[PDB]
Symmetry: none
Subunit: 392 residues, 4 copies
């Protein structure tokens, strides 16, 4: 016996548009509906939860330990514990791995892991203690500063996307075609109802009416090639990366309920998947979108799998440029990759995104009867993270 | 196989006073000194590090994933990984448990773990995207909001301290004595040089001069009972908890280099300790200070130890009120607890604290030849974390 | 010598709604349009103007001396002078009076005078020099603080409205019926093109298309009594003053070209009127709304006129409570007061209001053939101002 | 007869250094003390005051109509009226002319007029109603934005001071020599007790000790030429204007009690002087410092005086450059100009300054026995204000 951890249930909120559906909704409120959903979906009571682990990159101003606020809201008992973590864009997936490890070391039985992010609610800030004798000073967008910018060179992540576009010789036309495809695929999945199983509706509490949000709002309908082609390079004036072939700024939460394989068998739960391996690797910050390459490779080696053994893949679409370079290097069949669209369409709620794509993978593996899956993301500052899933 | 992880080496900066020695030093610069130090003290090169894991509660405005910043600054290679975590006051110790689990489950060989915090540099913020159509709005002190306030009932942690004072019938005099004793013990320890081993000096790079910081500046010298007795209660106009019998606002970093016991041996390292067990449990938020009770018990049970087996103990002094209740309920010999003073004197740099007291425990264990230790902290929002360590 | 000052010409921008048509238009820009307008209307060249005087209450962040900025934009030469003034709500009419005095004392020949206000562009502010060691601080809405709040009692102007309402025993129903009557009057005048003459169109300079504003946007079309009677008290909680029976938050500018009666004859100008008298008087800030009573009476005594001699009156509608009280006490025929509706419908761009209503009176006095006219406003901090005008 | 308007009395606070003696004193508190002092020194009851006129450039956040606040706090009754005005740096001397005009037009019997300024209390601000969707923004220093920045070309007043220097060929050694001379003259005078009479003491209400400010604290004692020659230029990096030969940022208030000459004589009051003329003129903004030239020539033509005639002058030293050029062109004897020093030494409380120098002139005229006096100032944006005084 070697530990075997399973994913008993999963869920996500719709991914809200920047200052959209979740514009004034705290990340923990989203996370709390996702916690209640995994619990209800699994047939597990809040009472049984030992720990809640929630990847989250932008918690400034939300109060002490937003993960515990989420667990507490969801009725997870005070006797349980909770914590937040930050491996930037990888966070939501990394948390799942960290969850797995709690069970594997005998420290916990039942874990809810994933991530949550409200980019809309990220505040602007300034260090004012010393005090500003005289003159103007900057109020800093914490979302840009703490979530989207390279810490060591100063530039937007998009600049790394360009570095990757230049290196892999990825034309504007390749990048835009990829973008348009992500949209059209995500539209088709959405229209066919392929996101319903994974999405838990979220009730946005109002003064003048409650609003039920259960549709991914960032997905553009009838996206045209021309709409992409017309855009201006966003980061480099003779660049190639645009706001249309990059993912956006988004809100959401996503999580999974985990237990041992034998525990799921005792409870009669038909799990979404066995966690067969995971990995995280570093790369050059300058080309951070390449992260998935060494991370997926290492994850696969750990499972004893060939790239060609995979039946479905979710590789997060930070930028068309990096998603393209990843697909090229790995060489896996692109028809099995982000089959229901990706982040360019669906969005990128940073700390939740790793769990969001996991949710998409898992519910698509169930529906198509895919045996072996892999989810992976690039990570600002130069890292990768990947996870292998096998169906039971 | 039952993995066995050792702490090969450890270090910490001196603990800075609010807006004092480290007033404009970013937390990751503190962390980077400590990473370098654990490496040099262990005889391990930075190239050998697989992951850096740093608890940090107040990273707003520092830029993306300060743990990575710290790790890169210290010459940890881009191929390694790094991430931050947040379990409030527990974080710096939890990070060490979580680094242990990385090695236990075969994912890493070498981990640097602890925490870092610059409460000084924590900014003021506001959510300003929606705009403010009209009326006044708060610029919120992130330090207080995200670090020191109960997220549910809204009040300062001192209120939970009052709740513990009331419940355990802890007089003002008893709290003040406890406080004065922490000061006196820390001063003794400092003058005799007992912080020297644990502290790595930190160079505050100036303009008109580099200043080396290697002494704990929060410790007040010649602290009198009358100076404690004269203070007004800080949270409850007829309460008992004061600025003097509470910890302060502080800046620091602290860490442990971890590896398997078989690896230390290969390397010929004489480790500071073996991690025999850890535990984290929740309690009622209203009395979060009682955290250490169920976590310490669970940790000892896990280790197979009685309370009486312990030779040394570091229990973090957030508030004299809670430190007293912990010591009462546990009933361990108070002459073995915080033998070189605690956080009322030394300071409480939130995310670094758990690794700070682990540092103090390890180096005193080595000094005096103590076989069995325990580090534990209370955690805001109602938790506790604890770790058992055995000498080799 | 008996001087004799005439208003050669006059014009106002339309009145914009809070965060509306002029949401991003600086005051002096609205001001500059009005300055050139009175010049073009009078057939006097900008280079003939000796001085510009503009009432302005909320000039924070617009830069040095916005009166000099509006004058310069409007093509008044540098050899001239310009200044701003603040008698709060009465500033715009008071400036008109200050200009008359320049000519009377032989210090100037041609003056432009009035007021300008952008309540939209009023910032939030905080005193931040000392620095802020710890704790939240307030970001202060200068529109509320410097414009709508009584300095001596600390409450909103609407509270002084409650006071006057209680003093005069003005029912909610009476206050509301005034409010609907003012809206219906205004909506009638607008449709009928009675505001055309005085309104000079303003061009909102844009990126994605220029826009011409020439219609008062705050007037509610189809104002009903039932819609009024549904609202809640805005200030007091069993009060009588609502948002529907008080004036709004608005932007705009208004001015008048002044010169000696003889000067206008030299130039073939047919003046809108002769300034016969003016007067300002103080009252209790708690009932600041009563201000127009002593002021209007003083003004009438200086003119050597009786109340019944007036053919037309513009008495500013700060609050239906106060407007109703003033009218009740003076006993001037309601049918000659605010004939084209008042501020409850038109809005109340503070610094500009007083020239605003001067414009309305002057042009409607031209139109119907009225010979004697009176303008008056209540003033925050417990003042009144008034002016008497006679047709040539 | 003729409108003959006299200064019955005069008083001024000491001028404070920036963030110094009056660091947390609101302007209106400084103003109230000065209004009370003009009344006492004259022997006039506060209830006899008709209206109060206070220049003031930086009222952001002080609340509704600070001139009204000054007046009420000073004990002037609610019946009186009060308002502020901004002709920037001339505001405080222009206000005296405005009040004179109230009495000359027969609209008022007794006026208190001057200026007030807390440049230390001036806050930082931003326009945030619309909201800041994404990205960094500036919090703006209103002192700078609204007080010392030319709104047209964008630059600090010291650049226009540079423009006058290059134009007038005023060396670094020439301006330095004027600066030292203005400090010695001002220090000498202060030691002699020559500011005593004009100054009313102000009481800084403290918590741990009240403090009596009765000395100009911006004056620097033992001012040498070498410290002045060792300064780096502040505005132009290879320039000629420094912090040392330019005026400073300061706090203070100052005023004059006004009434007709016939009136003074009824009350048995020996006036400080009679206002014989005044004037205000525009100039090229770029070279704003030259304002005092055409304004004094004008003032003198309206008095029907020659420059020679003058027995004493107070020409405001905004900068050493603008000053020397105003001294050079007009050709008035330098010995009678700023005889007790100037604004370089004493300081420059923007909206109060004009009223400040009027005080020095009036009181020094009284002591030394000068019959004819002139005060004058340059004004940002390109204006001059000036006033001719005659002793009885």
């Amino acid at each position: 016996s070697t530990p075997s951890i399973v994913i008993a249930s999963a869920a996500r909120t719709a991914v809200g548009s920047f200052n959209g559906a979740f514009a004034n909704t705290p990340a923990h409120e989203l996370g709390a509906t996702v916690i209640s959903a995994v619990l209800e979906r699994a047939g597990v009571a809040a009472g049984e939860v030992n720990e809640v682990i929630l990847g989250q990159v932008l918690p400034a101003g939300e109060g002490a330990n937003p993960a515990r606020q989420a667990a507490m809201k969801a009725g997870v008992p005070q006797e349980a514990t909770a914590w937040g973590m930050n491996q930037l864009c990888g966070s939501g997936l990394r948390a799942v791995a960290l969850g797995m490890q709690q069970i594997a070391t005998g420290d916990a039985s039942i874990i809810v892991a994933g991530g949550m992010e409200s980019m809309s609610m990220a505040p602007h800030c300034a260090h004012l203690r010393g005090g500003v004798k005289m003159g103007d000073f900057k109020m800093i967008d914490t979302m840009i500063k703490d979530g989207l910018t390279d810490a060591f060179y100063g530039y937007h992540m998009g600049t790394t996307a360009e570095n990757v576009a230049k290196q892999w010789q990825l034309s504007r036309d390749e990048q835009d075609a990829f973008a348009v495809a992500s949209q059209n695929k995500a539209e088709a999945a959405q229209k066919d109802g392929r996101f319903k199983d994974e999405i838990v509706p979220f009730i946005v509490k109002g003064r003048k009416g409650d609003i039920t949000v259960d549709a991914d709002e960032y997905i553009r309908h009838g996206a045209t090639l021309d709409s992409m082609a017309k855009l201006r390079p966003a980061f480099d004036k003779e660049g190639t990366v645009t706001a249309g072939n990059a993912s956006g700024l988004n809100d959401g939460a996503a999580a999974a309920l985990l237990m041992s394989e034998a525990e799921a068998s005792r409870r009669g739960i038909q799990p979404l998947g066995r966690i067969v391996s995971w990995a995280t690797v570093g790369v050059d910050p300058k080309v951070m979108g390449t992260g998935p390459i060494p991370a997926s490779r290492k994850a696969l080696e750990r499972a004893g799998w060939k790239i060609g053994d995979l039946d479905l893949v979710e590789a997060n679409e930070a930028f068309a440029a990096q998603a393209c370079a990843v697909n090229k290097d790995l060489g896996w069949d692109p028809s099995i990759v982000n089959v229901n669209g990706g982040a360019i369409a669906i969005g990128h709620p940073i700390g939740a995104s790793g769990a969001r794509i996991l949710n998409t993978l898992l519910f698509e593996m169930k529906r198509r009867g895919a045996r072996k899956g892999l989810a992976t993301l690039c990570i600002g500052g130069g890292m990768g993270v990947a996870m292998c899933i096998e169906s039971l």
